[PDB]
Ligand binder design. Structure first.
Ligand code: DOR
Ligand code: ZN
Ligand code: ZN
Ligand code: ZN
Length: 362
């Protein structure tokens, strides 16, 4: 007996196109999404070239429309040069992404004043998300308060961070956050097995106490999101390993296993992979869209999942219970039992749908 879920949303994926298509492209990354029970993705802007201006966004929009197999929105990226220049295209993006710690030279901000400038100039009704670790979480919260608006904190990974966000929510501040599966299901205990190359990710893997704090404080977590960050094994195992794990194909099986064990409820899962992504990012419903999962099937995660071009996974060897059997996307069978059945280009930019525009005062 299968369970019907709504179309799940992953608000944090790196699909590498343009410029890193050996790691992933729209077609392969959205195949991975569908196989993971995800029907809508929000793609991050740290591509090559990065999505930091209108021409780059225009290119990325067309590449996605031609390659995506599920629906999508594209983030814009903040740079040291683009504050005050994005107003005409801002509403066409998923939101604005700030990279406040390590990142590409093009997305590096060297001063909190530049963060300020972005919070002041980006349209106040549109989402802002920040990669902000440890004290950077408190710093960007301060900037959000000074500019009187909300912020969403990406991939919270530490006890310190979730407790700071908890304290901010207790003071009524408009902050939301997401957590990625590797920060719920992997820890320092796994670094022996992974090694120092494969184990590289930002935010880094936490201690057992970090992991336990995130579970303890599930009420504080608004969204789950993969931070799908595909890199090839050659890159992960080489001399300058880039941070990041692939995660689209493993996220839902890992979380269904947790539901099975009573660690969170099905509703808790659906708030975090459907309702809260919708409401934080103003993402539209998808008509005639659903995912059928089998909650009894026990399997072991292999050395690589079928679809991501990353061709490896840090969850190799973990035993899971739960599998995606079928995905229907806008009335068409998109995935069944290991086969993706919609072509590249079936997916659409949800920000172009009438119901996908963010409401604003005239
Ligand atoms: O901040 C990031 C970005 C990402 C990537 O590879 O694009 N991977 C990470 O591990 N952290
Ligand atoms: Zn990040
Ligand atoms: Zn994020
Ligand atoms: Zn990311």
């Amino acid at each position: 007996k299968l369970v019907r879920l709504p179309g799940l949303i992953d608000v944090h994926v790196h699909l590498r196109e343009p410029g890193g298509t050996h790691k992933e492209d729209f077609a392969s990354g959205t195949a991975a999404a569908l196989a993971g029970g995800i029907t809508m993705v929000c793609a991050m802007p740290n591509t090559r070239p990065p999505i930091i201006d209108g021409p780059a966004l225009a290119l990325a929009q067309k590449l996605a429309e031609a390659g995506a197999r599920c629906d999508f929105a594209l983030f814009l990226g903040a740079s040291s040069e683009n504050a005050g220049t994005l107003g005409t295209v801002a509403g066409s993006a998923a939101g604005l992404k700030l990279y406040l710690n390590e990142t590409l030279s093009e997305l590096r901000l060297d001063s909190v004043v530049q963060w300020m400038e972005h919070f002041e100039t980006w349209p106040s009704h549109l989402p802002i998300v920040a990669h902000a670790e440890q004290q950077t979480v408190a710093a960007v919260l301060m900037v959000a308060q000074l500019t009187q608006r909300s912020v969403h904190i990406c991939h919270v990974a530490r006890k310190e961070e979730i407790l700071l966000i908890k304290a901010a929510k207790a003071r009524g501040l408009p902050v939301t956050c997401e957590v990625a599966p590797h920060h719920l299901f992997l820890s320092h205990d796994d670094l022996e097995r992974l090694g120092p190359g494969k184990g590289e990710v930002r935010p880094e893997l936490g201690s057992r106490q970090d992991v336990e704090a995130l579970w303890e404080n599930m009420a504080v977590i608004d969204c789950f999101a993969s931070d799908h960050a595909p890199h090839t094994l050659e890159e992960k195992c080489g001399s300058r390993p880039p941070p990041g794990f692939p995660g689209l194909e493993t996220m839902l099986p890992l979380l269904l296993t947790a539901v099975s064990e009573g660690r969170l409820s099905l509703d808790d899962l659906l708030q975090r992979l459907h309702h809260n992504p919708r409401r934080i990012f103003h993402l539209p419903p998808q008509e005639d869209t659903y995912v059928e999962v089998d909650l009894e099937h026990e399997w072991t995660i292999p050395s690589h999942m079928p679809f991501s071009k990353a061709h490896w996974t840090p969850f190799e060897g973990q035993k899971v219970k739960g599998t995606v059997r079928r995905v229907v996307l806008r009335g068409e069978v998109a995935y069944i039992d290991g086969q993706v059945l919609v072509p590249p280009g079936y997916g659409q930019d949800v920000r172009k749908w009438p119901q996908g525009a963010v409401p604003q005062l005239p």
